[PDB]
């Protein structure tokens, strides 16, 4: 359950999330778009869920993609900000899951974001330790889908 997955965020895992986010969340537009383009490149099958965004290969020049990418980073920001209180992290995660459930996005489908995150982290000199920490966070959202 989401309450059990949230308890998997141990002390060091939370610390690593904060340390990496400090750098990554420093450029929400840049890292946000990079995150989305990497997803579409490594998992072309997910582009179908984003028909409304139009020509996704345009990248930064696509206003709708840019708007979505920026917005996505604020959701991550919200998660990081709730790490201190498990009860608040959970209600924020379930709130966020509502619309993804409506789009019929499964836990397995959501998990495809781990690849893009690992690559963006690596581009910033953050290794496997950090990618695994983020996977743990993503797993909390997966438990709610």
Residue 109 touches which of a copy of itself, ligand HEM, none (CB < 5 to 8 A by kind)? Answer: ligand HEM
Strand runs (DSSP E) across the chain, as ranges?
none
Residue 82 touches which of a copy of itself, ligand HEM, none (CB < 5 to 8 A by kind)? Answer: a copy of itself
50 binds a copy of itself (CB under 8 A): no
* Token pair listed for 86: 């498990």
Question: What angle, rounded to 10 degrees, do the helices at 128-142 and 11-24 form?
Answer: 100
CA distance 92 to 94: 6
15 binds a copy of itself (CB under 8 A): no
The residue among 141, 29, 23 whose CA lies nearest residue 93 is: 141
Tell me whether residue 68 is annotated as binding: no
Q: Which of residues 74-103 bind a copy of itself (CB under 8 A)?
A: 74-75, 77-78, 81-82, 87-88, 90-92, 94-96, 98-99
Contact 134, 8 (CB under 8 A): no
Residues at the binding site are 100
Which positions lie near ligand HEM, rule CB under 6 A? 46, 49-50, 52, 68, 71-72, 75-76, 95, 98-100, 103, 105, 109-110, 112-113, 138
């Amino acid at each position: 359950s989401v309450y059990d997955a949230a308890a998997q965020l141990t002390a060091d895992v939370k610390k690593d999330l904060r340390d990496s986010w400090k750098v990554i969340g420093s450029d929400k537009k840049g890292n946000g778009v990079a995150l989305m383009t990497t997803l579409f490149a490594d998992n072309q099958e997910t582009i179908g869920y984003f028909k409304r965004l139009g020509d996704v290969s345009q990248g930064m020049a696509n206003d709708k993609l840019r708007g979505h990418s920026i917005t996505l980073m604020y959701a991550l920001q919200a998660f990081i900000d709730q790490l201190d209180n498990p009860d608040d992290l959970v209600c924020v995660v379930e709130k966020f899951a509502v619309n993804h459930i409506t789009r019929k996005i499964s836990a397995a489908e959501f998990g495809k974001i781990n690849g893009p995150i690992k690559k963006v982290l690596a581009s910033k000199n953050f290794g496997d330790k950090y990618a695994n920490a983020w996977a743990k966070l993503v797993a909390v959202v997966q438990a709610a889908l």
